[PDB]
Amino acid sequence: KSFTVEKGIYQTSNFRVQPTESIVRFPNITNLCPFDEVFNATRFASVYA
Amino acid sequence: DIQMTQSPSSLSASVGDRVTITCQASQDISNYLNWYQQKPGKAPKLLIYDASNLETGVPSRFSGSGSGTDFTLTISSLQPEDIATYYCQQYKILLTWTFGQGTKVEIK
Ligand SMILES: *[C@@H]1O[C@H](CO)[C@@H](O)[C@H](O)[C@H]1NC(C)=O
Ligand SMILES: *[C@@H]1O[C@H](CO)[C@@H](O)[C@H](O)[C@H]1NC(C)=O
């Protein structure tokens, strides 16, 4: 924060290396999921059961 | 998908006899069945609308029972005024509906 620097040593900041690629991994299950059987079903059960 | 089967395809009997019929399914469907009768003509008719519950306005010569995937219908005393077509159908999805195949009856 000045226009003049005295003789010596100084410490300013830090450095970090950057990545270059993106990787994702998931299991290979490919079955359609049965949400249909419950949401639009015909008759629902009773509260006490 | 849901698929039915009926058995046997046809049978014949005489008056005053017990008759039976079987309807089978590929997976349990929890007693949501019914049967339809349709004589040669125009209008199919509702006969039994549950596992063992019958529609009003029909005499008491009919019975039937079942659960899981095993379902049987029967008539205790055949009468000559019974020559028609029969079917079993099911329902568990809001719309995925299908009838069976067909059962034939003939008199002696
Ligand atoms: C799919 O995942 C299974 C799980 O072990 C694995 O054995 C298989 O090699 C993977 N790939 C294919 C094409 O099945
Ligand atoms: C249930 O049935 C309705 C019929 O209109 C459909 O729009 C809906 O997507 C179905 N539910 C599921 C989870 O598929």
Side-chain angles (χ1 to χ4, degrees), chain B residues 64-80:
Chain B
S65 177
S67 195
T69 186
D70 263 9
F71 299 95
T72 59
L73 192 141
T74 196
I75 297 169
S76 52
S77 160
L78 188 153
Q79 295 185 358

Side-chain angles (χ1 to χ4, degrees), chain A residues 10-22:
Chain A
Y10 298 96
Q11 186 162 353
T12 62
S13 165
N14 63 7
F15 64 93
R16 304 190 300 290
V17 68
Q18 297 284 322
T20 60
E21 212 174 4
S22 307

Side-chain angles (χ1 to χ4, degrees), chain A residues 36-37 40-43, chain B residues 32 50 91-94:
Chain A
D36 75 322
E37 71 76 22
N40 58 26
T42 311
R43 294 211 279 204
Chain B
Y32 303 148
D50 216 18
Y91 47 92
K92 68 174 318 206
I93 296 90
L94 188 153

Side-chain angles (χ1 to χ4, degrees), chain B residues 27-78:
Chain B
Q27 60 266 0
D28 196 340
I29 62 171
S30 66
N31 78 359
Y32 303 148
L33 283 72
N34 61 3
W35 301 83
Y36 282 91
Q37 182 183 46
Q38 174 259 342
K39 64 90 176 179
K42 277 73 69 177
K45 189 175 210 224
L46 191 85
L47 259 58
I48 287 190
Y49 64 92
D50 216 18
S52 308
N53 194 359
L54 73 165
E55 153 60 24
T56 62
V58 166
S60 314
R61 304 131 301 160
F62 306 98
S63 87
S65 177
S67 195
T69 186
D70 263 9
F71 299 95
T72 59
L73 192 141
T74 196
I75 297 169
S76 52
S77 160
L78 188 153

Side-chain angles (χ1 to χ4, degrees), chain B residues 83-94:
Chain B
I83 298 176
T85 63
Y86 300 108
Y87 293 115
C88 50
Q89 85 182 340
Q90 52 64 20
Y91 47 92
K92 68 174 318 206
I93 296 90
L94 188 153

